Every structure is written in structure tokens, then in C-alpha cells.
Write a protein that binds this DNA or RNA. Structure first.
Length: 187
DNA sequence: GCTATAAACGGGCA
DNA sequence: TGCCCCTTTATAGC
């Protein structure tokens, strides 16, 4: 439990990685769809072949421009590992795929701070950043500015941390908010 | 299922 | 440029 990087003693667990990659060749989406079993394609709803693999369980959206977005992994390494497996698939189906400019694009994390949270008290004294309409959505949307991270804060004490590009942004965001959430420990 | 968040992609409207 | 979609993921109330 590394105290320096996380004085709270709680580390958020990563829940979803969104990465993209440039295969750098033009693809026949219809041919890929016919020859692949794990690939769906309806171009009149969405211009991407949706491919899914089980290990690591991820979903790829592959486009005729040769751009691919990989989604569903729970680590950046698993995102790159999955993105490679997709690129080898299209290679074996007869396309000169490359692996150019792989970039994590969005990381989703979550954790628990163990204590219930008085949401109405935080939505008031942090009205500049908070948006809390419980009849619409039971969590309050907290828009942190440095780092530019959105937090979903719930009464139970569970929080969602989104919008980060690097996991250190997720870790830094959680602990800019933890001493805040401590002031609103519900009785 | 709906409601809420972020991101990339291609694509509709303006 | 803006608006709206598009997939995924945690969270949670109806």
C-alpha cells in the first residue's frame, strides 16, 4: 500500500481502457465481416465492423480507413495486447495491416472510500464543479479541472473516475477528491 | 431498459 | 465548429 503516491491507502482499480491504432491500409469491411465469425457489421447503423475476442475480453471497432479503436480491457498492457491480436486477425484474412500510433485514449477507474457520502452537502459547497439532480441520475457529476477528470460520486461511497489518459491522472484525481469526501461523511 | 460520465472512430443534421 | 449517434465500463434509482 504505497503511501507516497496514495496517502489515502486506497488505489482505484482500472475498469476500462479505450485505445486506438492505425493499421495503415484500406479494408473491405464487408469481406472481413463474411470471413470472420466474431464480427458483426450493419453499415446502415454504424460504419464499423464490430469484432469481439474473449481473452482478453475486448471489442474492436474496425473501419474502412484502417483505423481501429479497442475497448473493454482493464489494463493498458491488455489493451495493446488485444489490439495486436486484432491486427493479426485482419492480416491473416488477407490485408497488409500495420501497427502505427497506438495510443491509450481514455481510462476508466473506480474505488470505494468505505464511508457513505452526504451528496447534497457536497453539491452545495462545491456547486461550481458539481451537478446533482437525483431524480434524473442518483450520482453527482463532479468536474475536476486539474487534472481534467470527471468523477461520478454516489451516496454509497463508490466513485467512478473517467476521462484520464494516464493512470496517474486517475490516481491524482481520486486523492484531490478524497479529503473533500471526508468532509461529507454521512452520519 | 431508461437516466449519467469520458474517449476514439465514421456519419447523420445544421 | 455545434448538435445527435456510434462501444465499452464502473456506478445506482425506477
Amino acid at each position: 500500500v504505497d503511501l507516497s503516491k496514495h496517502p489515502s491507502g486506497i488505489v482505484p482499480t482500472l475498469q476500462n481502457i479505450v485505445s486506438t491504432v492505425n493499421l495503415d491500409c484500406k479494408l473491405d469491411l464487408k469481406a472481413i465481416a463474411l470471413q470472420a465469425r466474431n464480427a458483426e457489421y450493419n453499415p446502415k447503423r454504424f460504419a464499423a465492423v464490430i469484432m469481439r475476442i474473449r481473452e482478453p475480453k475486448t471489442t474492436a471497432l474496425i473501419f474502412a480507413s484502417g483505423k481501429m479503436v479497442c475497448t473493454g480491457a482493464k489494463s493498458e498492457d491488455f489493451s495493446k495486447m488485444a489490439a495486436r491480436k486484432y491486427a493479426r486477425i485482419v492480416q491473416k484474412l488477407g490485408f497488409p495491416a500495420k501497427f502505427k500510433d497506438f495510443k491509450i485514449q481514455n481510462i476508466v477507474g473506480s474505488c470505494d472510500v468505505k464511508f457513505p457520502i452526504r451528496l447534497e452537502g457536497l453539491a452545495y459547497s462545491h456547486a461550481a464543479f458539481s451537478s446533482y439532480e437525483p431524480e434524473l441520475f442518483p450520482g453527482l457529476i463532479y468536474r475536476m479541472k486539474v487534472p481534467k477528470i470527471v468523477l461520478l460520486i454516489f451516496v454509497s461511497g463508490k466513485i467512478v473516475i473517467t476521462g484520464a489518459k494516464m493512470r496517474d491522472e486517475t490516481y491524482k484525481a481520486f486523492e484531490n477528491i478524497y479529503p473533500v469526501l471526508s468532509e461529507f461523511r454521512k452520519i
